[PDB]
Design a binder for these strands. Structure first.
Ligand SMILES: Cc1ccc2c(=S)n([C@H]3C[C@H](O)[C@@H](COP(=O)(O)OP(=O)(O)OP(=O)(O)O)O3)ccc2c1
Ligand SMILES: Cc1ccc2c(=S)n([C@H]3C[C@H](O)[C@@H](COP(=O)(O)OP(=O)(O)OP(=O)(O)O)O3)ccc2c1
Ligand SMILES: [Mg+2]
Ligand SMILES: [Mg+2]
Ligand SMILES: [Mg+2]
Ligand SMILES: [Mg+2]
Ligand SMILES: [Mg+2]
Length: 540
DNA sequence: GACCACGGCGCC
DNA sequence: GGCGCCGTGGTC
């Protein structure tokens, strides 16, 4: 089809490119091509050829930009058909799916990926041209956001490696203590990491009562909720829970992270995936830095490993009760809006209620526990479920969920309106028009339909929170450039920045105001902001 | 070696 | 409700 022409391509060409591996910060650039005007240009030597580009324009453009930045080239990402397709329908998450759906095949040759990007973009641009609000999201949010994300990915975050190695040894010894005891109590050794072998010991050998079954294969479950409930039944249970906590943290964070330090940067480099969720949230992978531990004491020691560069500080910014505020705006509920206009704190109140203590008797772990309840109920957990969580009697767990929606009456009407409109149009949308298609709203099996309903009415809330954060990042990022600060991480409703010591305070201020004023709702948005040498200390 | 489903669980 | 990653038990 396309005519072969010598590198370099004309300006505005679409790029195709092949990596030795998926992570742009670790990949070798194996091949690079560009397509325009019925021509394909194949770069004789990919790395040198990178220099001739003014923009990365095509499928997965941000990945190439990150690699370009890694090599010291300011090559910003531009148009990316993935972003167009993701906006049309957030189930469009892979180039293979998007290719197949919108006019090509995702292959392993850079020239074909180049030609593909050009074709897909033409086709998707057509599909998105009529959709004014999706077009605004692309232009004002997703396209610029992709540039911000490239810089974040290429920058990475410093990690205290020596600290984590030493931590590992401490935790290994405690783990051996726990497994030794568990084996003594079981009467014999087994693979304590195997939930199948654990199930036999707990339920066949020790004769403990099985409480629940696993979803797919119907095994007797050994999950934390099951064990939690058997705490009093046998002393092996508590020891297992402790074993589970430590091994989770050692296997997921303490051991892998030090091995992932980039040799050029001396830092850790996540990937921020922009077309990965049903709701418009970002995701993070390879490594995932959006689930760094924070709840338990050992989790906090791990979070402490994320530190500022020498002479710099971390600045951590976290939206306050973000999705409950979004809900207030979307529902128009006067009581809920009133709560936020009065500067109240719903998690502290629930926490006060939960633990039965003064408003001023709530600490960061009571409050945190109060989050599960508020978001749990709002997004439709059943009274029975809440009984088990507290754990308080039914009807007491049922009375909380009734007084919860009686205090906030328009929330229900918004939920019912959203669902009705979802059945009719086949999708729900955020405040800015981001869509999620939810076809099962009309399923004839109740539990499928009702799962679909929960996904459907959650998406405008979670997704709008996500729109706001992305737009905040887009506005904030060029202000930071000017001040010499760096944006390092996004964690859904939180940003972590790195700033020179002497500028940290002005940077915290600036970021807080940009985030709070990103898009005035019927309620104020508030941001908690902390500064410190490590991530744990920067909160807040 | 790579990949898979699963159970399980870390965060928002 | 939304994610991504772990080890096990597998297959290939
Ligand atoms: C166990 C469980 C189950 C569901 C959820 C759900 S759905 N979220 C959703 C709702 C949150 O708004 C948003 C940001 O989370 P954050 O922890 O910052 O909460 P916040 O309300 O902003 O409080 P803050 O004032 O910052 O302390 O993510 C969070 C945790 C969670 C945990
Ligand atoms: C753009 C720009 C630049 C600088 C500033 C500075 S310096 N301030 C300082 C001056 C006053 O001492 C104080 C009053 O504000 P408020 O009562 O809100 O306190 P807060 O810290 O904002 O708490 P909050 O999170 O809002 O609850 O904040 C405020 C806004 C501002 C905006
Ligand atoms: Mg928050
Ligand atoms: Mg947060
Ligand atoms: Mg203020
Ligand atoms: Mg404040
Ligand atoms: Mg799974």
């Amino acid at each position: 089809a396309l005519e072969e022409a010598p590198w370099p391509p004309p300006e505005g060409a679409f790029v195709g490119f092949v990596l030795s591996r998926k992570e742009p910060m670790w990949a070798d650039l194996l091949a690079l091509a560009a397509a325009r005007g019925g021509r394909v240009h194949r770069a004789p030597e990919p790395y040198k050829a990178l220099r001739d580009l003014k923009e990365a324009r095509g499928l997965l453009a941000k990945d190439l930009s990150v690699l370009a930045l890694r090599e010291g080239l300011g090559l910003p990402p531009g148009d990316d058909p993935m972003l167009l397709a993701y906006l049309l329908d957030p189930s469009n998450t892979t180039p293979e799916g998007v290719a197949r759906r919108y006019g090509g095949e995702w292959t392993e040759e850079a020239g074909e990926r180049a030609a593909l990007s050009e074709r897909l973009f033409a086709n998707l641009w057509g599909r998105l041209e009529g959709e004014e609000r999706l077009l605004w999201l692309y232009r004002e949010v997703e396209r610029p956001l992709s540039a911000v994300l490239a810089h974040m990915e290429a920058t990475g975050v410093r990690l205290d490696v020596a600290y984590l190695r030493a931590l590992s040894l401490e935790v290994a010894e405690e783990i051996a203590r726990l497994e030794a005891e568990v084996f003594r109590l079981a009467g014999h050794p087994f693979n304590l990491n195997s939930r199948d072998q654990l199930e036999r010991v707990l339920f066949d050998e020790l004769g403990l009562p099985a409480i629940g079954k696993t979803e797919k294969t119907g095994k007797r479950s050994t999950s934390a909720a099951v064990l939690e409930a058997l705490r009093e039944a046998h002393p092996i249970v508590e020891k297992i829970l402790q074993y589970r906590e430590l091994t989770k943290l050692k296997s997921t964070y303490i051991d892998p992270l030090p091995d992932l330090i980039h040799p050029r940067t001396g830092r850790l480099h996540t990937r921020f995936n922009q077309t990965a969720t049903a709701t418009g949230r970002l995701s993070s992978s390879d490594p995932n830095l959006q689930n760094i531990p924070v709840r338990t004491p050992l989790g906090q020691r791990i979070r402490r490993a994320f530190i500022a560069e020498e002479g710099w500080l971390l600045v951590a910014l976290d939206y306050s009760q973000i999705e409950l505020r979004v809900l207030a705006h979307l529902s128009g509920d006067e009581n809920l809006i009133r709560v936020f206009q009065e500067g109240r704190d719903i998690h502290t109140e629930t926490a006060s209620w939960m633990f039965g203590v003064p408003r001023e008797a709530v600490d960061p772990l009571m409050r945190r526990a109060a989050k599960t309840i508020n978001f749990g109920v709002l997004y439709g957990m059943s009274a029975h479920r809440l009984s088990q969580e507290l754990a308080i009697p039914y009807e007491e767990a049922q009375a909380f969920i009734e007084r919860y929606f009686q205090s906030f009456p328009k929330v229900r009407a918004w939920i019912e309106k959203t669902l009705e409109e979802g059945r009719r149009r086949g999708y729900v949308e955020t405040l800015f028009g981001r869509r999620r298609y939810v076809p099962d709203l009309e399923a004839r099996v109740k539990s499928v339909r009702e799962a679909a309903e929960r996904m459907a009415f959650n998406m405008p809330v979670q997704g709008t929170a996500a729109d706001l954060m992305k737009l905040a990042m887009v506005k904030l990022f060029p202000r930071l450039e000017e001040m010499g600060a760096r944006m390092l991480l996004q964690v859904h409703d939180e940003l972590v920045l790195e700033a020179p010591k002497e500028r940290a305070e002005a940077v915290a201020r600036l970021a807080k105001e940009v985030m709070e004023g990103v898009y005035p709702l019927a309620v104020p948005l508030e941001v908690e902001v902390g500064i410190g040498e490590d991530w744990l200390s920067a909160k807040e």
